[PDB]
Amino acid sequence: MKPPFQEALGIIQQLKQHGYDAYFVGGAVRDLLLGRPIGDVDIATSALPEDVMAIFPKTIDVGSKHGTVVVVHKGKAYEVTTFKTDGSVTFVRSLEEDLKRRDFTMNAIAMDEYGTIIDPFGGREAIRRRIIRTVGEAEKRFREDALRMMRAVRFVSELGFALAPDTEQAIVQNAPLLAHISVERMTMEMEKLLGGPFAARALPLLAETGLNAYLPGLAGKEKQLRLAAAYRWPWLAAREERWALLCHALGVQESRPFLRAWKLPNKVVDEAGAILTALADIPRPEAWTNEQLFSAGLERALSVETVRAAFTGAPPGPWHEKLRRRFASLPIKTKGELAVNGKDVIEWVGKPAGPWVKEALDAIWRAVVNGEVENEKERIYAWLMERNRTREKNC
Amino acid sequence: MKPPFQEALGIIQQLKQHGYDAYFVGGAVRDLLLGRPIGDVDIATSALPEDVMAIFPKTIDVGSKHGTVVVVHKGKAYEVTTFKTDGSVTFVRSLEEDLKRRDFTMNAIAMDEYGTIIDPFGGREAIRRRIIRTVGEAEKRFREDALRMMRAVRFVSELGFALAPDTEQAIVQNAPLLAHISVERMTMEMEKLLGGPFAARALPLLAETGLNAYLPGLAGKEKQLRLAAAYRWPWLAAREERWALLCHALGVQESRPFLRAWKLPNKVVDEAGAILTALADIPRPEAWTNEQLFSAGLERALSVETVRAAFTGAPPGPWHEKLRRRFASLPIKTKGELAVNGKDVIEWVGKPAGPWVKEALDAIWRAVVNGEVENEKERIYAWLMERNRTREKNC
Ligand SMILES: Nc1ncnc2c1ncn2[C@@H]1O[C@H](COP(=O)(O)OP(=O)(O)OP(=O)(O)O)[C@@H](O)[C@H]1O
Ligand SMILES: Nc1ncnc2c1ncn2[C@@H]1O[C@H](COP(=O)(O)OP(=O)(O)OP(=O)(O)O)[C@@H](O)[C@H]1O
Ligand SMILES: [Mg+2]
Ligand SMILES: [Mg+2]
Ligand SMILES: [Mg+2]
Ligand SMILES: [Mg+2]
Numbered sequence: 001m002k003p004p005f006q007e008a009l010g011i012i013q014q015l016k017q018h019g020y021d022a023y024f025v026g027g028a029v030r031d032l033l034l035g036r037p038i039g040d041v042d043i044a045t046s047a048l049p050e051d052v053m054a055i056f057p058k059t060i061d062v063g064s065k066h067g068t069v070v071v072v073h074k075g076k077a078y079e080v081t082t083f084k085t086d087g088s089v090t091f092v093r094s095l096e097e098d099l100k101r102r103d104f105t106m107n108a109i110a111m112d113e114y115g116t117i118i119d120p121f122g123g124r125e126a127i128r129r130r131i132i133r134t135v136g137e138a139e140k141r142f143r144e145d146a147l148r149m150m151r152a153v154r155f156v157s158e159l160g161f162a163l164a165p166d167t168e169q170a171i172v173q174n175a176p177l178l179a180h181i182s183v184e185r186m187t188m189e190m191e192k193l194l195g196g197p198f199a200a201r202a203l204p205l206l207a208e209t210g211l212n213a214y215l216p217g218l219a220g221k222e223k224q225l226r227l228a229a230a231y232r233w234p235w236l237a238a239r240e241e242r243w244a245l246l247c248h249a250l251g252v253q254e255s256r257p258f259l260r261a262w263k264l265p266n267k268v269v270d271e272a273g274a275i276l277t278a279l280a281d282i283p284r285p286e287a288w289t290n291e292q293l294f295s296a297g298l299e300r301a302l303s304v305e306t307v308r309a310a311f312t313g314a315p316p317g318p319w320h321e322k323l324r325r326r327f328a329s330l331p332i333k334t335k336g337e338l339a340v341n342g343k344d345v346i347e348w349v350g351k352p353a354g355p356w357v358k359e360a361l362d363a364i365w366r367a368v369v370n371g372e373v374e375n376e377k378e379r380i381y382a383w384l385m386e387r388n389r390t391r392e393k394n395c
Numbered sequence: 396m397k398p399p400f401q402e403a404l405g406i407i408q409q410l411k412q413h414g415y416d417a418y419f420v421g422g423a424v425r426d427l428l429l430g431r432p433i434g435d436v437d438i439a440t441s442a443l444p445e446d447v448m449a450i451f452p453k454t455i456d457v458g459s460k461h462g463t464v465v466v467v468h469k470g471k472a473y474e475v476t477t478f479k480t481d482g483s484v485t486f487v488r489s490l491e492e493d494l495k496r497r498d499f500t501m502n503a504i505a506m507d508e509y510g511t512i513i514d515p516f517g518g519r520e521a522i523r524r525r526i527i528r529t530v531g532e533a534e535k536r537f538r539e540d541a542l543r544m545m546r547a548v549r550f551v552s553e554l555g556f557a558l559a560p561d562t563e564q565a566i567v568q569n570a571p572l573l574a575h576i577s578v579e580r581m582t583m584e585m586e587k588l589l590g591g592p593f594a595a596r597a598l599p600l601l602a603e604t605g606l607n608a609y610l611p612g613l614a615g616k617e618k619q620l621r622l623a624a625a626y627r628w629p630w631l632a633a634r635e636e637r638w639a640l641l642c643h644a645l646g647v648q649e650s651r652p653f654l655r656a657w658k659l660p661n662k663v664v665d666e667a668g669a670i671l672t673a674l675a676d677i678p679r680p681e682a683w684t685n686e687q688l689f690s691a692g693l694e695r696a697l698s699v700e701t702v703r704a705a706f707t708g709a710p711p712g713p714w715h716e717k718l719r720r721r722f723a724s725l726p727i728k729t730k731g732e733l734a735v736n737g738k739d740v741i742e743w744v745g746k747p748a749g750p751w752v753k754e755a756l757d758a759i760w761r762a763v764v765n766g767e768v769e770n771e772k773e774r775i776y777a778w779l780m781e782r783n784r785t786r787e788k789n790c
Contacts, residue, residue: 050660050662051662058471058472060455060457060465060472062455062457070455072467072471072472075470075471076453076467076470077453077455077467077472265445265449267445267446267449
């Protein structure tokens with residue numbers, strides 16, 4: 001009894017004591033056997049949602065309508081779900097029927113309270129071989145829920161299994177069925193897929209299967225998805241870093257409409273574009289300017305250098321370290337640190353408030369950051385006063 | 396900082412550090428002030444669902460569509476919700492706007508990370524006075540969401556506050572609007588209502604307001620709901636015990652269609668009926684038979700005696716204790732313990748399998764339970780053999 005299951009045992013044990021019968025199901029079982037770090041623990045049972053909610057003190061009703069109830073047990077959330085047959089939903093008492101309806105054999109294993117693997121579909125066998133194979137007829141399953149095809153690919157990215165020959169074939173043959181699946185759902189698969197350790201060969205697969213060109217903005221980018229195999233994807237440590245690089249590798253022109261079409265939240269779309277733009281604007285790591293670094297703020301500069309690294313092969317290590325150093329010597333680090341205020345500039349220049357003020361303050365921060373003048377009132381004043389009779393001597 | 400809020404502080408503190416601003420809202424603030432045991436802590440914030448989900452490691456998406464996200468923090472689930480204006484939903488940045496849309500002034504208080512009470516609608520006053528008053532126009536609020544009326548009454552039951560004269564008036568004037576609210580939602584209110592410490596006066600209230608007779612099966616039971624005031628409701632310790640007694644007190648004829656019309660889950664409807672039935676079959680605590688006790692199993696017998704107690708005024712103490720004792724001396728406690736098997740009876744009586752076998756086994760368990768014969772094979776055999784030549788001497 002490995003620690004992730006050890007603590008979830010309470011749940012099974014209690015469902016059993018009320019005469020129910022429950023099992024560990026899902027990736028966690030897969031992971032355990034595969035030797036992976038264990039993902040998160042799910043419990044399937046013969047108990048119906050209102051029974052689960054009656055037995056355990058804290059329960060969250062996530063979706064009891066399709067069998068699932070969240071149980072908070074000794075401090076964590078677990079998803080407990082009644083055994084079901086995938087049509088509205090029908091509940092049963094057969095664990096075997098509940099496994100039959102699961103996507104791939106690896107995912108279709110179960111473990112009992114005593115640690116016994118129950119594996120009626122040869123998932124264990126598929127794990128030894130490292131194969132993603134559909135439970136039952138590859139074709140039928142994908143018709144039932146086209147999204148399964150997407151998962152199959154991401155699983156390739158996540159575990160470096162290979163697609164079974166006939167399962168793969170089914171995908172190309174059943175590609176179209178995707179555009180019936182709501183974007184949101186595809187996005188979370190894509191995101192996982194990009195963060196796969198094997199992302200490097202999952203992107204190409206996205207092309208050699210029919211899946212490309214039913215995914216948003218991946219219309220005929222087949223050439224592009226193949227050359228993607230050369231990108232050092234796994235050093236991307238962040239969501240934005242990922243999307244950014246995806247764009248860069250697909251030669252995406254305007255980041256905004258694309259990342260939007262994927263229904264990613266605004267802040268991510270923005271930040272990804274930010275990185276992307278910075279990267280167009282700084283073509284070499286030495287090229288960073290106090291200005292642009294200040295402008296970008298340490299984090300994003302770092303991400304830029306990481307995304308660059310994932311494209312070049314040059315580890316970001318040394319740059320990240322110089323950026324960290326530079327940033328911490330920037331005479332000011334935010335605009336709010338500026339020792340001088342918009343209203344000061346007004347009193348000094350005898351001009352009424354307006355759009356010239358921004359321009360002033362802008363020229364000032366830059367001058368402070370470039371260290372042309374200290375961040376102190378008296379010295380900016382002189383600086384500004386003297387630079388206003390220079391604009392007179394020029395035109 | 397009381398312990399319920401102490402641990403939730405983290406959530407606020409983090410939302411604030413990302414520059415958001417969040418408050419403790421809801422019953423828990425009310426509870427705190429009223430001096431009650433604190434119900435469960437909720438957080439309202441200016442941050443949007445996707446921000447909350449971004450900041451906190453474990454999050455459950457219960458309903459981000461209307462602003463709510465559950466955050467698992469240091470081992471508990473908390474409901475975090477973006478400030479909103481009740482129409483689709485509009486998110487704002489005003490805490491004041493978010494409180495304005497809540498049901499009653501007691502429920503519309505707020506507390507900040509430093510323990511400051513923010514109370515723009517005089518909830519604090521309404522607590523001092525012990526009054527349920529609508530936030531804003533009593534009439535308008537009930538039109539917006541008729542369920543509010545139900546809550547007001549259950550809160551009466553839960554806190555012993557009185558309804559404000561004009562709020563009450565609004566209920567009678569706006570009673571009809573209930574039949575637009577789905578039963579399920581009324582059921583959970585009713586259930587709380589029945590388990591109030593003041594249930595004794597909430598049920599009558601249900602009648603003196605127009606609410607009665609838009610609640611299922613409470614058509615013109617006005618007379619009955621008033622006399623309900625005399626029932627010792629607060630000793631009912633269980634859901635079934637409650638419904639049971641509610642039936643008994645409404646003179647409900649057939650338990651089953653009634654409890655069903657309330658959409659309670661089946662096991663409850665069943666068990667309630669069980670208790671109710673046993674109660675019609677045993678009119679005095681002394682009257683319990685080894686038979687009927689064995690037939691009911693300790694739990695239910697106890698529940699019967701408690702439901703009786705709530706109707707009579709005689710404390711169930713002594714009976715509960717004798718039942719516990721009797722049940723633990725029942726020669727067998729389940730039908731499975733019987734020392735003799737259906738197939739034994741066939742071999743013994745030379746008759747083919749069939750419906751007479753049940754009848755035999757039935758007569759046997761009863762005889763064991765009544766202690767007419769030991770629960771042992773050899774002795775049941777004789778008992779049965781000798782009782783089969785008695786049915787010959789009789790007809
Ligand atoms: N689209 C689907 N069709 C059939 N079964 C599915 C589908 N999606 C999920 N499942 C089943 O339920 C589980 C889904 O859980 P989930 O997708 O969270 O984790 P997992 O696939 O097991 O691994 P991971 O934790 O990495 O995501 C799978 O184990 C599989 O049994
Ligand atoms: N129908 C409604 N109309 C307006 N506001 C509501 C409504 N239902 C709930 N609320 C608001 O949200 C909170 C709902 O919390 P909830 O019903 O869970 O607990 P509570 O009423 O505050 O007290 P308790 O924990 O005992 O139930 C209330 O405090 C109130 O602010
Ligand atoms: Mg999983
Ligand atoms: Mg978990
Ligand atoms: Mg509450
Ligand atoms: Mg809580």
